[PDB]
Write a protein that holds these residues in place. Structure first.
Motif, short mmCIF file in Angstrom:
data_model
loop_
_atom_site.label_atom_id
_atom_site.label_comp_id
_atom_site.label_asym_id
_atom_site.label_seq_id
_atom_site.Cartn_x
_atom_site.Cartn_y
_atom_site.Cartn_z
N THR A 194 0.94 -1.09 -0.02
CA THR A 194 0.01 0.01 0.13
C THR A 194 0.73 1.40 -0.10
O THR A 194 2.09 1.45 0.32
CB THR A 194 -0.91 0.05 1.22
OG1 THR A 194 -0.22 0.01 2.42
CG2 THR A 194 -1.80 -1.25 1.24
N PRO C 35 -8.77 -8.96 5.72
CA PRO C 35 -8.87 -7.68 5.29
C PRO C 35 -7.72 -7.48 4.28
O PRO C 35 -7.97 -6.24 3.54
CB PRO C 35 -9.40 -6.89 6.27
CG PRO C 35 -8.52 -7.22 7.41
CD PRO C 35 -8.50 -8.74 7.37
N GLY C 36 -6.66 -7.94 4.59
CA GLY C 36 -5.54 -7.21 3.80
C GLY C 36 -4.15 -7.63 4.66
O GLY C 36 -4.31 -8.37 5.38
N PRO C 39 -0.60 -2.41 7.49
CA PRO C 39 0.11 -1.21 7.07
C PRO C 39 1.30 -0.97 8.08
O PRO C 39 0.92 -1.01 9.15
CB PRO C 39 -0.86 -0.45 6.51
CG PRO C 39 -1.80 -0.35 7.61
CD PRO C 39 -2.06 -2.07 7.91
C1 BTN Z 1 -9.09 2.63 6.55
O1 BTN Z 1 -8.00 3.62 6.76
C2 BTN Z 1 -8.71 1.57 5.55
C3 BTN Z 1 -7.85 0.73 6.40
C4 BTN Z 1 -7.47 -0.72 5.41
C5 BTN Z 1 -8.11 -1.78 5.91
C6 BTN Z 1 -7.50 -2.87 6.10
S1 BTN Z 1 -6.11 -2.22 7.09
C7 BTN Z 1 -4.80 -3.66 6.33
C8 BTN Z 1 -5.49 -3.95 4.91
N1 BTN Z 1 -4.93 -3.56 3.87
C9 BTN Z 1 -5.64 -3.18 3.32
O2 BTN Z 1 -5.83 -2.31 2.05
N2 BTN Z 1 -7.03 -3.47 3.65
C10 BTN Z 1 -7.00 -3.92 5.09
#
Ligand code: BTN
Ligand code: ACO
Ligand code: ACO
Ligand code: BTN
Lengths: 507, 182, 179, 148, 91
Positions: A194, C35-36, C39
């Protein structure tokens, strides 16, 4: 309009890709196009393009519009040769939908992945992508899965090299994790999942594009990229040179090339490199450069885990891998980062029948809670495992220190090594004289007198050599001659191991 | 025998050879042991045995006997060649590489060879200098000892010392400034 | 914990476990709700890319039965990392609450309709069509959508017929795990 | 409308296939439907249907119309047992576009072909088709090649 | 040992038995050597050793000793059974 006219019009558009204005911007930023990069990489005239007329089949969200019909669908695929040797390539084109991945995009890459595995030829990818193409939705996610499956299947079968020539985001960032080497271009290429936009939105942290996933970060701190090159032209020139080291498939022996460097010459420069004083560091690279053919050495990750040196070189024409300690950095101790880089390199060279040369000078492990809580035990097992399971020739020379468990980790003879040489300055012991004598004579009087006797008998390479740990003690000037002799007779080595579905590396 | 190798049929090598501030057009062809080289219209014939490992390469250029030394080579075309005692820097690109290389951005970084920082944490046990002391390239400046090892820090610049920031007995970390040169 | 995201530590534990079970012919059951990825610079500088490849590799090279059920979220590249069907899986079930997408509705719609008016109206249409397990299932990503109460019965049926499974792979001296 | 309602509506349509009026004609001619044939062939209750919610992705020539969206895309695929022994089956449904072969049609059959080879179980096909689905063109020709 | 076989748990066999011009509703269950058969509401118990290869099959139906012969069988449900000397066709 005849069919030939339509064909010619498609050929002209496929060459322009995203269009001349996009190409103009591509150059303004200081980047070459995907087709210009291939022309530089491969032997002139050797490249044959495949599936140049394939277009996407998605009709939703306006994708059916003529303005979106870019022949080639953002990848250039095909085959060629580098110095007469067959190689498959593909290159992602950033000027067409941002280089995003579509269903058809992946399909073309997979096609190359399948032909290369079937014939036994390396694949070199030039990656540059903005991530998944959201207009297709879940089709691009299947694309990634199919590419990942091929990258895993090809492991240990054909070399896989990935050169990053621009940004890379989303699922695309995982393909270099499955290939064998990852290279980048300084200040041009990025690797992240990201972008900074998400980091700022999720957590209260401030970061820019270069700090988050720039080439300098991944070659100096995270240990992800094996080397960054200054620009696109130099990156591909060094890539051609790197290519010449590797076999085409794991079924092939290490390549042997014409060599003018006499195999039986001495290197007097080695006799005085290693100081007699134990607290004086020296540059291990001076030894490596003097032994290898014509003093050419290809160093991997020069700026990451500097306490261990790994790289490629030739001796008597044959490609070999070299691993050794760097006493200048952290006294030459092993730590988490050095074990990760070492184990990865050793395992690749074993898989593709490239002999290993080890230069040992290691006083032990880096102490402290920073390493204990980091899993130094779990990580150190990676390098020991990588050497112990090797079936390719292993030639170890000990230049000075080998204390403690590090002796065995750095490819000791009892891990099915072929030869083990010591220089007169080598010392092999469970620990140094101070620890060993104070522990042995704990609570006794005249410990210092006992230490003098202990040092005279054990502070030398002889109590190990007389037990069969060392095959010979050689004048350092002869090191090259001894190694050359072993390599040219161990090359026909074959061993058997009990059958196992797969290996189980400690991780 | 499994993967036939086909030597590219390269009849002519078209090179762009950059010296100091000039770029010359050179076209070479191989006729065995002798290369026929056209340098901006001038015809030269360079004959040798071309033993590429020897430190001394003996060549004959149009009957003129020369000895040259190749000191370094890079994949990017950079070569360091000693000719009549003087080392000349030449960057040899192929026609294609030279034509596309013009699209690269001429980024320039700073040379900070006067700023000598600790490469390794530990205690400073010696400083060979005070401000005003002469410094040679490769000269030992500071010694820092830790992990039963003395890490010697050397200068990358010839000059004199401007300031000594860390003294013997001081403890320093990684990246701390030890000495600053003029 | 951490919204069910993948990070360095989770990938290390997962990959190690998956590889052992594959080596000793123990079937795998996967419960996906991810969800991913976690980060932040703490993970970027830690080699999250290099470490995440460990779990993807461990599943992709497996030759033992793999039964995956998706209980809710599967966004982004995490879908494939958590033993998706296209990594030579045997069966893949979704519960009615599953949602498979490259990203959530907010990211996808604002990116697709970037600079356009009435994005929120377009988002309502997008959510109705894509915020569900169907655009993946109709393409062959999911084999069935099952009432959660039947999950045990479905898994039991698959395990007792996949136990005789044998596959071939190209010969390799040894595997080359990303490390 | 909840997701569960949409799921139930798709299940009901997948069972009807081409629709009740087509099914009525199927019986008038003296033929059973594809699902009735499987129920007779396999041990009661042993059949597990796969990919029941897959639909074609062709949007050209009006194929994007809701009237053409038949879940199952003219084949019933799945696994079961005959007298306790594992067998894979598929059956072509003539009431949906005449039983013609689409890209997705073949894909589902190939999926069964791959699972059966991997485990080592027979495959029994019940064939009934009007040929290639011309609305997709060359996609159906690739379908045949993959099945072959 | 490679492909486990699982015997279907069939507790009841629901049959439609057509004779000459009548169709009867018969439900049978197995209790080992004896089948409990309900024929249009009538309960019968048929006990035998059920040796299916012999030309002569001896059965006991509610204490009544019978000998029958099965002359032919088809997969389509057709059976030719000789009962008291007469061959009856049952589907
Ligand atoms: C709001 O700020 C969106 C948060 C991202 C959602 C989660 S957190 C880590 C994963 N990565 C992603 O793109 N989505 C998930
Ligand atoms: C969670 C997961 O792992 S899935 C991740 C999903 N990834 C994506 O969809 C893309 C990620 N985010 C982005 O789009 C970012 O912009 C990145 C990664 C492409 C990087 O952006 P940049 O390098 O600045 O390229 P930029 O977006 O400015 O490029 C603009 C052009 O590229 C194309 N483009 C940019 N992003 C995308 C995208 N995500 N999908 C398709 N096309 C795109 C546009 O057509 C645009 O056209 P233009 O020429 O008229 O401008
Ligand atoms: C050279 C080669 O090898 S390629 C061969 C090319 N041949 C073909 O395309 C198939 C041969 N010709 C036909 O289509 C014939 O009609 C056959 C073979 C399908 C036989 O036809 P029948 O068994 O009578 O079925 P019939 O065509 O009456 O069925 C009618 C319905 O089926 C569907 N249908 C019929 N033919 C086709 C077709 N070729 N493609 C798609 N759908 C079809 C129609 O939707 C029609 O809908 P309705 O329910 O409103 O009537
Ligand atoms: C003095 O304090 C002794 C330092 C230990 C010497 C080095 S440091 C890390 C290695 N471990 C070990 O026991 N010896 C080596």
């Amino acid at each position: 309009t005849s069919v030939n006219e339509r064909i010619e019009n498609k050929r002209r558009t496929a060459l322009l890709g995203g269009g001349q204005r996009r190409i103009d911007a591509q150059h303004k930023r200081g980047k070459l196009t995907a087709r210009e990069r291939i022309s530089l990489l491969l032997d002139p005239g050797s490249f044959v393009e495949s599936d140049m007329f394939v277009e996407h089949r998605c009709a939703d969200f306006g994708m059916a519009a003529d303005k979106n019909k870019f022949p080639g669908d953002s990848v250039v695929t095909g085959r060629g040769r580098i110095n007469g040797r067959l190689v498959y390539v593909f290159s992602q084109d950033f000027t067409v939908f941002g280089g995003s991945l579509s269903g058809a995009h992946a399909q073309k890459i997979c096609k190359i992945m399948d032909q290369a595995i079937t014939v036994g030829a390396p694949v070199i990818g030039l990656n540059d992508s903005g991530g998944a193409r959201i207009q297709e939705g879940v089709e691009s996610l299947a694309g990634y899965a199919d590419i990942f499956l091929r990258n895993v299947t090809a492991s240990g079968v054909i070399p896989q090299i990935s050169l990053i020539m621009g940004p890379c985001a989303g699922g695309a960032v995982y393909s270099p994790a499955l290939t064998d080497f990852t290279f980048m271009v300084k200040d041009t290429s990025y690797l992240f999942i990201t972008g900074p936009d998400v980091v700022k939105s999720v957590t209260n942290e401030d970061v820019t594009q270069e700090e988050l996933g720039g080439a300098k970060t991944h070659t100096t701190m995270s240990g992800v990229a094996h080397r960054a090159f200054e620009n696109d032209v130099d990156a591909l020139c060094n890539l051609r040179d790197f290519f010449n080291y590797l076999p085409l498939s794991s079924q092939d022996p290490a390549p042997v090339r014409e060599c003018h460097d006499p195999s039986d010459r001495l290197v007097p420069e080695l006799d005085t490199i290693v100081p007699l004083e134990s607290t004086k560091a020296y540059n291990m690279v001076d030894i490596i450069h003097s032994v290898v053919d014509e003093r050419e050495f290809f160093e991997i990750m020069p700026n990451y885990a500097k306490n261990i040196i790994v790289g490629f070189a030739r001796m008597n024409g044959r490609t070999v891998g070299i691993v050794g300690n760097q006493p200048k950095v952290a006294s030459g101790c092993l730590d988490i980062n050095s074990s990760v880089k070492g184990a990865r390199f050793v395992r690749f060279c074993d898989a593709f029948n490239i002999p290993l040369i080890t230069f040992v000078d290691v006083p032990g492990f880096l102490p402290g809670t920073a390493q204990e809580y980091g899993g130094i035990i779990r990580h150190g097992a990676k390098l020991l495992y990588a050497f112990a399971e090797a079936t390719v020739p292993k030639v170890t020379v000990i230049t000075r220190k080998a204390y403690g468990g590090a002796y065995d980790v750095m490819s000791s003879k009892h891990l099915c090594g072929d030869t083990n040489y010591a220089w007169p300055t080598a010392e092999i012991a469970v620990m140094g004289a101070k620890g060993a004598v104070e522990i042995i004579f704990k609570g006794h009087e005249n410990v210092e007198a006992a230490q003098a006797e202990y040092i005279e008998k054990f502070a030398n390479p002889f109590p190990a050599a007389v037990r069969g740990f060392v095959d010979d003690i050689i004048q350092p000037s002869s090191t090259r001659a001894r190694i050359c002799c072993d390599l040219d007779v161990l090359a026909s080595k074959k061993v058997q191991r009990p059958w196992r579905k797969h290996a189980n590396i400690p991780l | 025998s499994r993967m036939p190798v086909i030597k590219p049929d390269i009849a002519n090598w078209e090179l762009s050879v950059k010296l100091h501030d000039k770029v010359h057009t050179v076209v070479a062809s191989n006729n065995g042991s002798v290369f026929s080289v056209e340098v901006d219209g001038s015809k030269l014939n360079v004959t040798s045995t071309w033993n590429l490992a020897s430190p001394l390469l003996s060549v004959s250029v149009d009957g003129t006997q020369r000895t040259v030394q190749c000191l370094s080579r890079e994949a990017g075309g950079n070569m360091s060649i000693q000719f009549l005692g003087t080392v000349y820097k030449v960057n040899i690109l192929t026609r294609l590489a030279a034509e596309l290389n013009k699209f690269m951005l001429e980024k320039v970084t700073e040379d900070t060879s006067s700023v000598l920082r600790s490469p390794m944490p530990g205690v400073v046990v010696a400083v060979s200098v005070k401000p005003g002391d002469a410094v040679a390239e490769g000269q030992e400046i500071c010694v820092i000892e830790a992990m039963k090892m003395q890490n010697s820090m050397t200068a990358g610049k010839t000059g004199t010392v401007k300031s000594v920031h860390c003294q013997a007995g001081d403890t320093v970390g990684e990246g701390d400034l030890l000495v600053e040169l003029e």
